[PDB]
Motif scaffolding. Structure first.
Motif, mmCIF file in Angstrom:
data_model
loop_
_atom_site.group_PDB
_atom_site.id
_atom_site.type_symbol
_atom_site.label_atom_id
_atom_site.label_comp_id
_atom_site.label_asym_id
_atom_site.label_seq_id
_atom_site.Cartn_x
_atom_site.Cartn_y
_atom_site.Cartn_z
ATOM 1 N N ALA A 169 1.022 -1.358 -0.494
ATOM 2 C CA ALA A 169 -0.340 0.116 -0.090
ATOM 3 C C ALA A 169 1.311 0.776 0.341
ATOM 4 O O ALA A 169 2.286 1.076 0.562
ATOM 5 N N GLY A 170 0.613 2.557 -0.674
ATOM 6 C CA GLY A 170 1.645 3.332 -1.081
ATOM 7 C C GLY A 170 1.075 4.250 0.465
ATOM 8 O O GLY A 170 -0.060 4.010 0.661
ATOM 9 N N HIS A 177 1.433 8.287 1.139
ATOM 10 C CA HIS A 177 1.919 9.598 1.795
ATOM 11 C C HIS A 177 1.535 10.450 3.143
ATOM 12 O O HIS A 177 0.474 10.094 3.476
ATOM 13 N N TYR A 225 -9.249 5.483 -3.408
ATOM 14 C CA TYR A 225 -8.310 5.531 -4.019
ATOM 15 C C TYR A 225 -7.723 5.569 -4.871
ATOM 16 O O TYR A 225 -7.503 5.320 -6.145
ATOM 17 N N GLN A 226 -6.837 5.819 -5.536
ATOM 18 C CA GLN A 226 -5.551 5.921 -6.285
ATOM 19 C C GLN A 226 -3.963 6.776 -5.749
ATOM 20 O O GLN A 226 -4.003 7.488 -5.564
ATOM 21 N N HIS A 227 -2.932 5.787 -5.883
ATOM 22 C CA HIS A 227 -2.033 6.378 -5.343
ATOM 23 C C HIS A 227 -1.199 7.158 -5.920
ATOM 24 O O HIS A 227 -1.015 8.337 -4.748
ATOM 25 N N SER A 228 -0.791 7.877 -6.915
ATOM 26 C CA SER A 228 -0.917 8.422 -7.789
ATOM 27 C C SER A 228 -1.388 10.235 -6.829
ATOM 28 O O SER A 228 -0.534 11.134 -7.308
ATOM 29 N N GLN A 276 -4.720 2.570 2.155
ATOM 30 C CA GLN A 276 -5.595 2.008 1.420
ATOM 31 C C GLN A 276 -6.192 1.582 2.231
ATOM 32 O O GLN A 276 -5.544 0.959 3.612
#
Lengths: 113, 113
Positions: A75-76, A78, B34-37, B71
């Motif tokens: 999982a990313g 940030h 959710y979207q990592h970017s 996430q």
């Protein structure tokens, strides 16, 4: 020369606080694997010795420390933080620690009284 | 009566800060998945809306806002915030917001100038 030393003593130096946070992370967590039951203890520790080392500096700073511990599962992660203060006196430090098993990001804020 | 009103004006009210954080998250994230970017943009928008509304409050405090987005894939979540300020005028607010697949934790601190 004396004014420079006084400013250095009264300023929120990023490097020393980063070393404090790194030492707190190493002492509380270490090379231990991820356990959901130990997240509370590790986070509370990291926060407590980070605060204790910040206060032992003797600087007139209201210290704010937050700790997040998260297992690695693809999982990313940030972590962003924007604030407004007097940039001349107050400072911030973002330290990110990770191993094979979990992530760990601890943010220490030093605000002049 | 006037003293109470002045104290309320100069007090860091938790409820309105929580409402501001919820509004910022809803306007910045809302029902989107959710979207990592796109985590960077969501966190930035949440924190900037929160800071803008908090500044529009006009209270004589210094503010720190941190937005964190996750996430929902089994990753363990835990946030703890123990710090050092003067509890008589400064306060903190932790707001947890979640949907079917996304976590967003935002913490706000306000310290007296």
């Amino acid at each position: 020369m004396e004014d420079y030393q006084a400013a250095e003593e009264t300023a929120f130096v990023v490097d020393e606080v980063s070393n404090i946070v790194k030492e707190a992370i190493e002492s509380a967590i270490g090379g231990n694997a991820y356990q959901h039951s130990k997240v509370n203890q590790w986070t509370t520790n990291v926060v407590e010795q980070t605060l204790s080392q910040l206060t032992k500096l003797g600087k007139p700073f209201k210290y704010i420390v937050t700790c997040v511990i998260m297992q690695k599962n693809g999982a990313g992660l940030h972590t962003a933080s924007s604030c407004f203060w007097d940039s001349s006196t107050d400072g911030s430090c973002t330290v990110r620690w990770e191993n094979k098993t979990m992530y760990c990001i601890v943010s220490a804020f030093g605000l002049s009284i």
